[PDB]
């Protein structure tokens, strides 16, 4: 558990060129680890803090590279 | 009769703007020249086809 | 978010400012709502009333109503009847003086109705009496605060009440001693734009305040739990918890 | 009146985006209360109006409009139901009325997380979260003078 | 930003109404090819070669 | 309902009817 | 033998100045404007403040 | 609506109903329950309209009386003569105030 | 012989029940569909029993 | 007529009707209705004669 606070952000989908996507995204985070490490601009989201986790996928405390490597792929590609 | 908009909207980038002041224009009154020049032009177009 | 059609219209046609209009309800309304706030953490925070050790034992337990003989004490007519509410204001704000420990309940809140209750009825210890409101201020226009009972309590018009009461507070001399803290941080800081696109302006306003909860303010409990804990209010420790704020309903009015 | 069929005009103030829609609620209404969060975490969140069965989780806020005396954002202290029994608007007032003077749903108003009023509408990337606005409607009366006489 | 009014004379009635007491010079779908204040006339002249 | 105004003279005497086992009051 | 008419009393006529009768009048003059009053505040005594 | 005693008649103030009189007996205390039925709304006025509470009354020459002949003021129960108010018109129609409003 | 004209009208704002009025150009002259027992300023109370 | 109370005498002001009286109760609420009834029609004779 975070024993703080999680900062829940929530991506949104959007078309990056002809028939591809830029997956929306629903992660909770860690408010320490969120404070530490966050990435998140121009990635077309709204956040908003609680003290649960207010969606499934979460990163507690100690993830960081765990998390770190999923905050940069808030932009990933697919079809 | 109620009265009716006419609305133009030009737009200058600043490495332009630069560049018209250093040509010899001036370039923030050119411009309010251009749009004043064309609805002044705009309205004969509205007016001289609103008697025909 | 207003056109910018609309202000050449509006100070052609009409002569008010636009602007300075919507700068006029966007400027009340926010300090319209962080007023609404508070009454509502204070009925919302406030324990009920007329209950536990307030109770007259066969009464119905948070409502007066002034057709239960055994709430107006057996009164007759009217003098008789709403001078047993001044009683019932009086038990609980004695009352928020054993829970808070600060002093008898020093202001109340209540409806438009109620205040006619009190306002028509002498407050003194004289007889049984009626007539006109009189004393205090019923309507709310010139202002919402109205009058003062014997000198003792200030009772507020809730002039938004869904069915009817009076919530009996307390506030201390000091800032500190509240039983919730409105504490405002900026005050409507205006913001001026335009839609880059079609030039048409946008207008916006911004606050910033927060609330507390009084620590000591549960007034159950000997000890705090995680010794630096949250004072915004919440359900756990807020909610029908204050002791400084005591509510009942009116009924029968 | 100096010229016939004189008129009055009269401005609402309006709120939501559209001065003049069907169902906008009037600002500073005599009778309606301001809805306590619309400013508040009402513009970053929104919530489910409450209706006739609508089981309410605990601590979860419901609006809910009065017909008389305002709009309110309603908490769940406790967990109940709204009996379908109550359908029109009048049957569903006194069913809430009997709940919330119970204590089980009752009514606040609160802020906004500044994380949520910092970004809003479009800074730092985020989307989809507009701010709430107000209108004002300004609508009109006319009114024709009506003659009368008599004779000797 | 410019406004204005551009409305047809008085006296100019469409055939619709033909009698109207409230008429609006603008909507030249009515207004068009009624008016007593002004007579158009086109002329056929020989093209220009490019 | 209605309303009749009855002084206690008729509550003296309803007071005494049921009190001393009658039949109406 | 001219008539001065009136307004159909619809409210539709009037506010265009529409008559029956020789003259359609400009409008419906204006008598002013009912704004709707700003309720009051209940101000900040009955709790703490500190700013 | 909201001016209701709930056990009223809604629409009509008759002082035979101890309901509507609050329980009010004889004179001074009936009447006395009467002007706060004429508080209550002139109140309530305040909640429709938003602009002020009831400024004026316009009555029967019976009402009139009935304003007339009752203390105005908060005391007890007292009844009488017609005194602060013109109960006939002739003179006027418009009949004194009430408590100065 | 004598002739007057006045007119009623009703304060917009008075029925007070509504945010939106109907039709945002409407007669103010007292009618039953708005006037009748809708204005806010003025409450009628048949009193009884005097 | 207009100085009735509807359940009263009509005619006769009779100080045993709990109408008449208003129910008053014992002496000093009960000649007190009289000054009443006394006042109702005094006031009515200016409705009569103007």
Same mark, same amino acid.
């Given at each position: 558990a975070s024993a703080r606070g999680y900062v829940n952000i929530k991506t949104f989908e959007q078309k990056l060129d002809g028939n591809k996507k830029i997956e929306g995204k629903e992660v909770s985070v860690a408010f320490p680890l969120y404070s530490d490490v966050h990435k998140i601009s121009g990635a077309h989201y709204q956040t908003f803090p609680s003290?649960? !986790? !207010?969606?499934?996928t979460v990163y507690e405390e100690n993830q960081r590279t765990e998390w770190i490597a999923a905050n940069e792929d808030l932009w990933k590609v697919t079809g | 009769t109620a009265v009716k908009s006419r609305k133009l909207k030009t737009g200058i980038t600043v490495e332009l703007a630069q560049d018209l002041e250093a040509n010899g224009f001036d370039a923030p009154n050119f411009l309010e020249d251009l749009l004043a020049t064309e609805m002044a032009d705009e309205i004969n177009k509205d007016i001289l086809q609103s008697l025909i | 978010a207003y056109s910018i059609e609309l202000t050449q219209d509006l100070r052609a046609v009409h002569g008010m400012d636009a602007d300075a209009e919507l700068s006029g309800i966007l400027a009340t309304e926010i300090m319209l709502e962080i007023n609404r706030e508070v009454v509502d953490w204070i009925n919302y925070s406030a324990q009920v009333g007329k209950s536990g050790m307030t109770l007259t034992p066969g009464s119905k337990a948070g409502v007066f109503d002034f057709q239960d003989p055994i709430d107006i004490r057996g009164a007759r007519w009217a003098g008789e009847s709403f001078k047993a509410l001044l009683f019932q204001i009086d038990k609980e704000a004695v009352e928020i003086a054993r829970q808070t420990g600060r002093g008898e309940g020093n202001f109340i809140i209540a409806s438009r109705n109620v205040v006619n209750v009190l306002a028509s009825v002498d407050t003194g210890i004289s007889y049984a009496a009626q007539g006109l409101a009189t004393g205090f201020s019923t309507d709310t226009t010139k202002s919402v605060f109205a009058g003062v009972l014997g000198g003792k309590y200030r009772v507020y018009i809730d002039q938004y009440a869904k069915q009817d009461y009076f919530t009996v507070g307390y506030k201390g001399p000091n800032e500190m001693d509240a039983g919730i803290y409105y504490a405002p941080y900026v005050a409507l800081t205006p913001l001026r734009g335009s839609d880059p696109k079609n030039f048409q302006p946008v207008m916006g306003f911004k606050t910033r305040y927060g609330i507390g909860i009084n620590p000591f303010a549960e007034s159950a409990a000997q000890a705090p739990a =995680?010794? #630096?804990? =949250?004072?915004?209010? =919440? #359900?756990?420790? =807020?909610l029908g918890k204050n002791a400084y704020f005591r509510r009942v309903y009116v009924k029968g009015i | 009146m100096n010229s016939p069929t004189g008129q009055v005009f009269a401005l609402r103030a309006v709120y939501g985006k559209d001065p003049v829609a069907a169902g906008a609620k009037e600002a500073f209404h005599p009778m309606y209360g301001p809805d306590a969060m619309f400013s508040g975490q009402g513009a970053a969140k929104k919530f489910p109006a409450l209706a006739a069965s609508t089981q309410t989780t605990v601590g979860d806020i419901y609006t809910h409009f009065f017909q008389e005396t305002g709009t309110v954002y309603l908490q769940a202290s406790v967990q109940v139901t709204i009996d379908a029994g109550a359908t029109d608007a009048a049957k569903l007032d006194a069913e809430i009325k009997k709940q919330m003077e119970a204590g089980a749903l009752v009514e606040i108003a609160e802020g906004m997380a500044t994380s949520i009023a910092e970004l809003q509408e479009g800074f730092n990337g985020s989307t989809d979260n507009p701010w709430n606005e107000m209108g004002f409607r300004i609508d009109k009366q006319v009114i024709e003078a009506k003659s009368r006489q008599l004779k000797a | 930003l410019v406004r204005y009014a551009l409305s047809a004379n008085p006296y100019t009635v469409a055939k619709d109404e033909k009698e109207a007491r409230i008429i609006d010079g603008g909507d030249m779908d009515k207004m068009a090819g009624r008016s007593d204040l002004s007579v158009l006339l086109g002329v056929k002249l020989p093209k220009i070669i490019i | 309902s209605a309303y009749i105004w009855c002084g206690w003279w008729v509550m003296d005497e309803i007071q005494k009817m049921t009190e001393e086992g009658k039949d109406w009051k | 033998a001219e008539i001065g008419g009136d307004h159909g009393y619809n409210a539709t006529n009037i506010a265009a100045g529409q008559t029956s009768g020789a003259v359609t009048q400009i409008g419906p003059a204006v008598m002013g404007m009912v704004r709707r009053a700003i309720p009051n505040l209940i101000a900040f005594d009955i709790c703490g403040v500190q700013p």
């Open positions: 003290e649960k !986790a !207010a969606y499934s | - | =995680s010794r #630096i804990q =949250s004072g915004m209010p =919440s #359900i756990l420790n =807020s | - | - | - | -």
